[PDB]
């Protein structure tokens, strides 16, 4: 519901923790022609927990929405905003012509036409260093060998699809077996032990009999895996007890 | 409760529809087929069918 996002080169990361996010409350906003999740589905979010979730916001000129994805290449993917191949998140976009455009021509958004090399994933290069293609030092202003990289998009309501301003939101989360901070509007049932029962911890499901073993974890550990990478220990999100998972009879 | 459409609305707000043509292609008696004209039932010879 913000008024004006940032540029693609100066995208603003909004860290989010200590909450319960009901992702269903996002659909009631502007249309989502693209709600692609590359590591998970757009439905299993309200059933899983997350370690650290971030939200990147930036406007683009529409025809470049395809570059916001793993393995993508282009001006935005190479100089402004790049995502890794192991990405685990969801990408959302929608048109904002009536918000981030003006008939007189808006010049607040930039895309960093040029750069020395390809920017790395999740990095920012808002530095205003004038690129230099020649050998002689630049005179502080654009010249035959140095050019101003901070170009701009002259958005206008008259432009057509592929040129109108589209807002893009990139929600990333790490589903590693680490302490969780966001889980969703899920409910909590009483604890049962010493009997075969299904369990749904912070994203971890399975069958087994808990026994409350003596495993002494560390302040940053929440799960324990055996030789076969099968979880055998879990920490209670509502207490400090260390439970031991074992297969039923 | 009911929705409401209006011509002056923009893209997306316009009305859309959906249709799901469920099919069943297992080996069972056929009730619907394509316009493929039926040829003659040549018998007692190696032919494609």
């Amino acid at each position, epitope marked *: 519901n*913000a*008024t*004006t*996002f940032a540029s693609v080169y100066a995208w603003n990361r909004k860290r989010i923790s200590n909450c319960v996010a009901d992702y269903s409350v996002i659909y009631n906003f502007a249309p989502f022609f693209a709600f692609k999740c590359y590591g998970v589905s757009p439905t299993k979010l309200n059933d899983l927990c997350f370690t650290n979730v971030y939200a990147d916001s930036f406007v683009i000129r529409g025809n470049e929405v395809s570059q916001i994805a793993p393995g993508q290449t282009g001006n935005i993917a190479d100089y402004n905003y790049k995502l890794p191949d192991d990405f685990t998140g969801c990408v959302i976009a929608w048109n904002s012509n009536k*918000l981030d455009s*003006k*008939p007189s021509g808006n010049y607040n958004y930039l895309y960093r036409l040029l750069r020395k090399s390809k920017l790395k994933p999740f990095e920012r290069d808002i530095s205003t260093e004038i690129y230099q293609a020649g050998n002689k030092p630049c005179n502080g202003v654009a010249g035959p060998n140095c050019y101003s990289p901070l170009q701009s998009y002259g958005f206008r309501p008259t432009y057509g699809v592929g040129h109108q301003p589209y807002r893009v939101v990139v929600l990333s989360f790490e589903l590693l077996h680490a302490p969780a901070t966001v889980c969703g509007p899920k409910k909590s049932t009483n604890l049962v032990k010493n009997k075969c029962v299904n369990f749904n911890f912070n994203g971890l499901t399975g069958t087994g009999v808990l026994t409350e073993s003596n495993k002494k974890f560390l302040p940053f550990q929440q799960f324990g895996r055996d030789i076969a990478d099968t979880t055998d220990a879990v920490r209670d999100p509502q207490t400090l007890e260390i439970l031991d998972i074992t297969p039923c009879s | 409760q009911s929705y409401g459409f209006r011509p*002056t609305y*923009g893209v997306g707000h316009q009305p859309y529809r959906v249709v799901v043509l469920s099919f069943e292609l297992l080996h069972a008696p056929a009730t619907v087929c394509g316009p493929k004209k039926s040829t003659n039932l040549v018998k007692n010879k190696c032919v494609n069918f």
Partner: antibody, heavy 121, light 109 residues
Framework: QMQLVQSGAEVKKPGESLKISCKGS????????IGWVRQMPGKGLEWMGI????????RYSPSFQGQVTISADKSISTAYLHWSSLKASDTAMYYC??????????????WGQGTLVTVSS | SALTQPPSASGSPGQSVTISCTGA?????????VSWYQQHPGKAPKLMIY???KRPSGVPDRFSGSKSGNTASLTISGLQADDEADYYC?????????FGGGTMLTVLG
């Protein structure tokens, strides 16, 4: 030269669905957000809602989501504030506004002249 | 949270006065969503400050704005006999315009 003009004063009884106007010229009315502001006697300003004359896109204040209906005629560049089942408490001055060539899309840089409304019984 | 302002303020010609404002909001777009409008007695308001470190074109330099934390400030380099009017700070961060409560400005009489 940009300029705005709204309807004149009005004094009527409740029940009637009043509808005042806010006409402007000198700009591309189809591509500039328009809205209205409420201000009771002795009180401050209160945001009513905005409209995008380019299409039917209209955002209304949460407390005024349905208490009033805002419309605009793109063929003549004239905004309208149509009411529905007026109440005696709706008496107040109403200013329409728009966004200029600078600032955010809802900065409300330019304002209208205002329209006094008294709908007592 | 709704915006709040001092009930009023006083001054005299030539003196530099300032007005405050508290209760702002924020978003991913920044924290500069504060605008001041001066409304004279019985007539349409006028925009005076937007992007507190800036202001519209043609606006006299007698006014200035600044922000600090959740509180803003409207600085005036000098008052005038015709400067007696109301002032309202307004926030437009989360696509929602929430005007201020209003504060009166007067001079010694």
């Amino acid at each position: 030269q940009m300029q705005l003009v709204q309807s004149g004063a009005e004094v009527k009884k409740p029940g009637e669905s009043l509808k005042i106007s806010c006409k402007g010229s000198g700009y591309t009315f189809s591509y500039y957000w328009i809205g209205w502001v409420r201000q009771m006697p002795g009180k401050g300003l209160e945001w009513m809602g905005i409209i995008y004359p380019g299409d039917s896109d209209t955002r209304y204040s949460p407390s005024f989501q349905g208490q009033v209906t805002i419309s605009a005629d793109k063929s003549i560049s004239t905004a309208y504030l149509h009411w529905s089942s007026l109440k005696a408490s709706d008496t107040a001055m109403y200013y329409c506004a728009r966004q200029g060539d600078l600032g955010d899309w809802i900065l409300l840089g330019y304002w209208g002249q205002g329209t006094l409304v008294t709908v007592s019984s | 949270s709704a915006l709040t302002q001092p009930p009023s303020a006083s001054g005299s010609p030539g003196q530099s006065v300032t007005i405050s404002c508290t209760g702002a909001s924020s978003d991913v777009g920044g924290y500069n969503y504060v605008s001041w409008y001066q409304q004279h007695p019985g007539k349409a308001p006028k925009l005076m400050i937007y992007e507190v470190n800036k202001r519209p074109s043609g606006v006299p330099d007698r006014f200035s704005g600044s922000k600090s934390g959740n509180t803003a400030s409207l600085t005036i380099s000098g008052l005038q006999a015709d400067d007696e009017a109301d002032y309202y700070c307004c926030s437009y961060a989360l696509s929602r315009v929430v005007f201020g409560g209003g504060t009166m400005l007067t001079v010694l009489g």
